[PDB]
Amino acid sequence: MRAPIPEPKPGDLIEIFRPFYRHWAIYVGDGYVVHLAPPSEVAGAGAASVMSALTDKAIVKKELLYDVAGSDKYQVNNKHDDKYSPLPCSKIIQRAEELVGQEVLYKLTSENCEHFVNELRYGVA
């Protein structure tokens, strides 16, 4: 059953459970997230190694949370809100949205997405 997400606030870390692993994102508005994605704004799924389903690249992207949640499941998980949050929500969101549209030359593993997104919430991975 669909439901709101009234506890989280823009600037919070989201995790995205996938069928056999997980992924990471950050909430940036009342429905949207910034996250790493496969190379999907550069090639028609037929002009990069994405066609071979074997690549070691990603892109920083923005999407509706409920599309990203289509992976399998999701949770809010500010991994160190128990210890730190040196940046206000405004700056966290501003960094997230400043960094959309670039490519990165590493795969979107759980570790690489966690690394990038922690750089937004806490200034450093």
Domain positions in the chain are 1-125
**Alpha carbon distance 125, 7 (integer Å):** 24
**Alpha carbon distance 13, 93 (integer Å):** 11
66: CB partners within 8 A, 6+ apart: 31
**Burial class of residue 21, CB neighbours in 10 A (0-12, 13-18, 19+):** exposed
Both tokens assigned to 124: 């450093």
124: CB partners within 8 A, 6+ apart: 118
Q: Which technique?
A: NMR
Let me know if 113 is a catalytic residue.
yes
Domain formed by 1-125, architecture: Alpha-Beta Complex (3.90)
Max alpha carbon distance in the chain (Å)? 45
Both tokens assigned to 21: 């692993």
Let me know if 23 is a catalytic residue.
yes
From the candidates 23, 80, 89, 115, give the one annotated as an active-site residue. 23
